Amino acid sequence: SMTHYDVVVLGAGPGGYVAAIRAAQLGLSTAIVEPKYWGGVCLNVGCIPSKALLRNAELVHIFTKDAKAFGISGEVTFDYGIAYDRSRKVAEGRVAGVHFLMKKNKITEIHGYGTFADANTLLVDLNDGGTESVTFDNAIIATGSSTRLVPGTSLSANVVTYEEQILSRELPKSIIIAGAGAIGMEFGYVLKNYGVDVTIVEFLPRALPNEDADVSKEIEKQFKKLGVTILTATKVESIADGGSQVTVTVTKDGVAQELKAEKVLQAIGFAPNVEGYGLDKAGVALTDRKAIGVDDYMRTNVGHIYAIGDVNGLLQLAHVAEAQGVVAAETIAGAETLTLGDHRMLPRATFCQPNVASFGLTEQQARNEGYDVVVAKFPFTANAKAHGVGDPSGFVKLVADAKHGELLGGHLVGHDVAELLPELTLAQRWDLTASELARNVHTHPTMSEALQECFHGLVGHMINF
Amino acid sequence: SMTHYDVVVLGAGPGGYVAAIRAAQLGLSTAIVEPKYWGGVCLNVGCIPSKALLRNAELVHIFTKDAKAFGISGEVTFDYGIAYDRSRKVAEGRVAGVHFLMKKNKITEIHGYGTFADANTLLVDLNDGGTESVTFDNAIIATGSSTRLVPGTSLSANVVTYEEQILSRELPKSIIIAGAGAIGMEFGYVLKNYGVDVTIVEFLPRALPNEDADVSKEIEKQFKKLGVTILTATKVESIADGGSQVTVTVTKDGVAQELKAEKVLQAIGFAPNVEGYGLDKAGVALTDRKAIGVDDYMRTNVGHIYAIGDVNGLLQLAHVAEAQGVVAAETIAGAETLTLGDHRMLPRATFCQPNVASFGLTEQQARNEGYDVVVAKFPFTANAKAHGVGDPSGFVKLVADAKHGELLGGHLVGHDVAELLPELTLAQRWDLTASELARNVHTHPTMSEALQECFHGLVGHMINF
Ligand SMILES: Cc1cc2nc3c(=O)[nH]c(=O)nc-3n(C[C@H](O)[C@H](O)[C@H](O)COP(=O)(O)OP(=O)(O)OC[C@H]3O[C@@H](n4cnc5c(N)ncnc54)[C@H](O)[C@@H]3O)c2cc1C
Ligand SMILES: Cc1cc2nc3c(=O)[nH]c(=O)nc-3n(C[C@H](O)[C@H](O)[C@H](O)COP(=O)(O)OP(=O)(O)OC[C@H]3O[C@@H](n4cnc5c(N)ncnc54)[C@H](O)[C@@H]3O)c2cc1C
Ligand SMILES: Cc1cc(S(=O)(=O)N(C)CC(=O)Nc2ccn(C)c(=O)c2)c2[nH]ncc2c1
Ligand SMILES: Cc1cc(S(=O)(=O)N(C)CC(=O)Nc2ccn(C)c(=O)c2)c2[nH]ncc2c1
After folding, report:
1. Residue A188 Cα, gap to closest chain B Cα (Å)
2. Pairing between strand A145-147 and A131-141?
3. Which of A2, A144, A372, B329 is deepest in the core (most CB within 10 A)?
4. Which of A42, A161, A279, A310 best tests ligand 1's pocket when mutated (most atoms within 8 Å of CB)?
5. Interval between CA A198 and ligand 1 midpoint (Å)
6. Which phi and psi angles does B226 have, rounded to 5°?
7. What whole-number distance in Å separates Cα of residue A296 and Cα of residue B107?
8. End-to-end CA distance of chain A, in Å?
9. Any idea of the CA torsion for B454, B458, B462, B463, to the nearest 10 degrees?
10. Would residue A444 show up in a list of annotated catalytic residues for this protein?
11. Least Cα separation, residue A85 to chain B (angstroms)
12. Could you please report the per-residue DSSP string of A215-275?
C-alpha cells in the first residue's frame, strides 16, 4: 500500500500520541504507527498500572502498621491477585481512552512496525499481515527505551524486567532488586507490603541518588523501617539462575558476598531504542551515550525529523515526553511555542508512601554551579494537616539564589507531596521570586502550607517554625 | 500590675498569635491576651481536631465500602473512641507549639480576659485572680466569633453546637444537622461513616451554597449515595428537646413536617464577638451586620486599633486570619505590606470525601458582574491517578476573563483537591494568564494534571479530553 502525510509519529506512547494530537489541532495531516502498546509503556505496563498497585500497597501499609493508632479492629487478608486485577482494568481503560483521542482528532492509526527507508519514507510491517509504504514531510520519533541489564547478566525464568514482573499475578517469597531508582523502590514498596522478602542493591552510595541527599536518607530509613534491606555502594557482579533459587554475587569495599532469592528484578536503567528500524537509512545522528540527539525544539540533525520522549534520553518521564511532543508539533506548524530549556528544572515524583517530589537543582548542585545559595527547610512535624492524616514525617526543602530570591530547586518528601510542585515550577518558569511567593495565601490546614513557610524562610524568618 | 507594650493582641487564635509573631519579628514589644484557647477555636475545637476525625472517617469509607474492590478479605471495624482520642492528642500537640512560638519570639503571654477601658488601656481579669492594666501604642483585636442559633431556639442537653459535639467521645444513634455549610457537611461525613443516621437541613436551595452550583450538585450526590439525607430549601421553625428525642419542625413550600432524632447540631453560621469587652469604651465602630469595620490595612475607625480574623466577618477562615494579622503588624511597623483586596479571591477548602476546593468567583458570579467569561471543565474520569487511587469522581472547573485569559475563579471537587489551589491563586495575584499557565508542566500521574488540561481548554483545545 501507499500513502502520504504531513506528520508521521513513530510510537504511540505518551510522547507520540500527544504529539499527534497537537499536530492534528494545528491542522496537519497526521498518522501514528504502533504495533503493540497504544499508550506505550506508561499506560500498559508503566505509570498507570504501577500506581494502582502502589495504592493497594498503601492500604496494606496503613493496616499492618497503624491499625492501633486509627482504632481498627478485625482479622483480614489482602489478596494481591485482586490488586493485580484492578491494575489491569485501570490500564485497559486508559488504553481505550487513547483510541478515543486518536479518533476524536481524526488521526490515522497504522498498526505495525515502522522502518526508515530514507529521510522521508517509512516502511511499515503490518500486524494483520502485509506491508505499507508511508511518506511524510515531517517525522516525529517517539520509540521509547528498553531495560538496561547488569553487564554480563541475562534474563531467564527467575530474572526479569519490570514488564514480566508487573504482569505477574502471583508473587515470589523473596526478591532481589538491582537498582534503587524510582522504579526499584516502587516495586520494593509494593512487594514488601504484600509479604515478600525484598533486598534492594544500588551501586551508588544513596537510594534514589538523583534526589537531594536529605531526601535519600529519609526514604532509606522509611524503607528499612518497612522491613526492606537496602545495600548502597554495592556492585552487582553476576546473577546465576538455578531454577530453584537465584544467586546474586555482590561486592563492597573489595569484599564479595552471595545473596539468594527466588527471583531477581533488573531495574538499573533504560537505554533509548535506536536499533532495528533504519535510523541509519534516515541519517539520524546519535549522541555519545547512544540517544537520539536533538536541539531545544526536539529536532535532530535532519531538520524535518524530531525525537521526543525517552528516546532522546533527556529526562525519561511521561509528562516530559508529552511536553516535548507539543514543542515538536508546534515547531513543525510554525506555531508559537516555548522551549523547555534546562530539563533539570522539570518536575518528577516517586509514588511510594511517603512520596518524593522535586524539581530543579539539589542544594549541592546549586552550590557546585556557582550560585549564592539560600535554603529553607520545614518539617511536616510542624504542619497541622500532616498530623491530621497521621503521617508527620518528611519535610519541604527549597533552594534559591540569594540575589533576587529566584527558585533554583525544590525537594519534598512526605504524604502525597507529589501534588505540591505546580506552584514551584510556575514561579520558576515566569521569574517569580520568594518575596512574591510568600504573599500567596495557602489554605489551612494543608500540606501546601509547608511551601508558604519555606517562602517566609527564604525572604526572612518563618512564622510557624 | 502596670505594663506598656508597642502592640497588644486580644485573642490567641490563628490571627492573633501570628500577628504577634510578625510584630515581634519587626522589633515591636508585643503581648497577647487569651483566657482559654491558645491557638483559638481552630487548634482546640476547630480545624485541627476536625481534620483528624475526617481522616479517620476517610479510612472507614475505604476499608468498608471499598473492601472487596481493594481485595480485602473482610470489613474491619473502626472505634470512634480511638478516633476521638487521637483528635485530642493532635490538638494538644499543636497548642503546645503555639506556646513554643510565643516563647521563641519573646512574646509576653497574659492569661486572662481583656476589657477596653479607653482607646489605649486594657483591663485584664487574670485567670489566677488578680487584675492587670495594660496600655499600648497599638491594639490588634482578634477575638473571633461565636455560633449563631436558629432564631427562637435554645441549646440544651441534646441540642448542641460544634464545640460540644466535637468534644463528645460517644456518638448518638441519629442526628439532625441545621446548616449545610462546610462545618455541617464535615460533621455529617464523620458521623455517617461511624454509623449515625444523619439528616442535614439547609435553608438555601443548595448544599455548600457558597460554592459553584456544579460543585453543590456533585457533593449532594456523593453524600446521598453515602446514605445521608439532605433537605434543601427547607427552613427550621422550632427545635423541641424532649430528653429521649428531639423534634425539629421544618417547612418547605408552605408545608410543615416534624423530624425526630436523638441530637441536633446547630451549624447555620457564626457571629463576630463584639459584646462584653468594652469596644464602646475604645470607640470602635461596627458594621450593619455587627462586625468590626476595617479598611484594606485592617484599621478600625480608631487609627491605632486593628481588627483581624473572624471578628471582622470578611472571610471566617484560619489562613485568612493569619494573613490579616501579617498585614496589621506590617502596617503598624511601617514595613512593606500587601493588602488582600477582594477577599472573594482567597482560597478555601472542605475536607470531607470528596474534597471541595475553590477560590475567586463562581461562573454565576463572574457573569453577573459583567465579565466576558470562558470556562474549562475537566472530569477526573479522564485522569490517570484518580483511577489509580480508586476515586475518579469530580472535576476541575476554571473561570477566566476572555480578554487576556486572566483567572477569575477556580472550583474543584474530588480526591485531595484541597492541595491544588496554590498554582491558581499565585497566577491570579501576579497576573499570569491561561497562556502562561498552560506552559507549566505538571507531573504525571497526578490529580494536578487536570489543572493543566483546563489551562489548555481556556487557551484552545484540551489534549487528553
Ligand atoms: C514500571 C514503570 C513505572 C513508571 N512510572 C512512571 C510514573 O509514575 N511517571 C512517569 O512520568 N513516568 C513513569 N515511567 C516512565 C514512563 O513509562 C516513560 O517515561 C514513558 O512511557 C515514555 O514515553 P515514550 O512515548 O517516550 O515511550 P514509550 O511510552 O515507551 O512508547 C514507545 C512506543 O514506541 C513503540 N515503538 C518502538 N519502536 C517502534 C517502531 N520502530 N515503530 C513503531 N512503534 C515503535 C513501542 O512499541 C512503544 O509502545 C514508568 C516506567 C516504568 C517502566
Ligand atoms: C469545627 C470547625 C472546623 C473548622 N475548620 C476549619 C478549617 O479546616 N480551615 C479553616 O481555615 N478554618 C476552619 N474553621 C474556622 C476557624 O476556626 C476560624 O476561622 C479561626 O479560628 C479564626 O481565628 P481567629 O483568631 O480570628 O479567632 P479564634 O480562632 O476563634 O480565636 C479567638 C480567641 O479570642 C479569645 N477572646 C475572645 N474575646 C476575648 C477577650 N475579650 N479577651 C481575650 N481573649 C478573648 C477567645 O477565647 C479565642 O480563643 C473551623 C471552625 C470550626 C468551628
Ligand atoms: C500520559 C497521560 C495519560 C492520561 S490518561 O491515561 O488518563 N488518558 C489517556 C486520557 C483519557 O483517557 N482521556 C479520555 C477522554 C475522553 N474519553 C471519553 C475517554 O474515554 C478518555 C492523562 N490524563 N490527563 C493527563 C494525562 C496524561
Ligand atoms: C494556623 C496554623 C497552625 C499550624 S500548627 O498547629 O502546625 N503550629 C502551631 C505550628 C507548630 O506547632 N510549630 C512548631 C515549631 C516548633 N516546635 C518545636 C513545635 O513544637 C511546634 C501551622 N503549621 N504550619 C502552618 C500553620 C498554620
Report:
1. 18
2. unpaired
3. B329
4. A42
5. 26
6. -75, -15
7. 54
8. 69
9. -80
10. yes
11. 9
12. HHHHHHHHHHHHT-EEE-S-EEEEEEE-SS-EEEEEEETTEEEEEEESEEEE-S-EEE--S
- The residues lining ligand 1, judged by C-beta closer than 6 Å to any ligand atom, are A 10-16, 33-37, 40-42, 46-47, 50-51, 113-114, 142-144, 162, 166, 183, 273, 277, 309-310, 316-319, 321, 351; B 444-445
Q: Which residue has the cell 476554571?
A: B398
Residue keyed to cell 431556639: B153
What three-state secondary structure class fits A30? strand
Query: Nine-digit cell at B79?
Result: 472505634
Question: Which residues from A are below 8 Å from B323, CB to CB?
Answer: 441
CA distances from A338 to A298, B283, B440 (A): 12, 58, 10
Residue A432 has which C-alpha cell? 517569580
Question: Count of H helices and E strands in chain B?
Answer: 14, 22
Contacts of B324 in chain A (CB under 8 A): none
Pick the atom of ligand 1 nearest to A45's CA.
Answer: 1
Q: Check A61, A304, A444, A456 and give the catalytic one.
A: A444
Nearest CA-CA partner of A326 in B445, B463, B382, B437: B463
Residues 6+ apart with CB under 8 A from B92: none
- Cα angle B26, B42, B208 (rounded to 5 degrees) comes to 120
Are A242 and A230 a contacting pair, CB within 8 Å? no
Q: Among B263, B68, B240, B234, which residue's Cα sits nearest to residue B161?
A: B263
Nominal resolution (angstroms):
2.2
CA gap A137, A116 in Å, rounded: 13
Residues in CB range of A420: below 8 A, 6 or more apart:
A357, A396, A412, A447, A448, A451, B419, B422
Residue A432 CB less than 6 A away from ligand 4: no
d(CA A25, CA A337): 14
Residue B143: which of B114, B107, B122 has the closest Cα? B114
How far apart CA B272 and CA B249 sit, in angstroms, is 28
What is d(CA B203, CA B250) in angstroms, rounded to the nearest whole number? 10
Name B74's Cβ contacts closer than 8 Å, sequence gap at least 6: A74, A75, A76, B67
Q: How far is CA B99 from the centre of its chain?
A: 23
Determine which of A84, A94, A443 to mutate to test the interface with B (most B C-beta atoms within 10 Å): A443
Interatomic CA distance for residues A453 and A382, integer angstroms: 10
Report whether B367 contacts B213 (CB < 8 A).
no
Distance CA A434, CA B246 (A): 54
HEC secondary structure over B214-227 = HHHHHHHHHHHHCC
Mutation site, A440, A452, A456, A459, interface B, largest B CB count within 10 A: A440
* Cβ–Cβ under 8 Å, residues A261 and A172: yes
3-state secondary structure of B336: coil
Beta strands in A291-345 (DSSP E): 305-307
E strand or H helix at A163: helix A162-166
Which method resolved this structure? Answer: X-ray
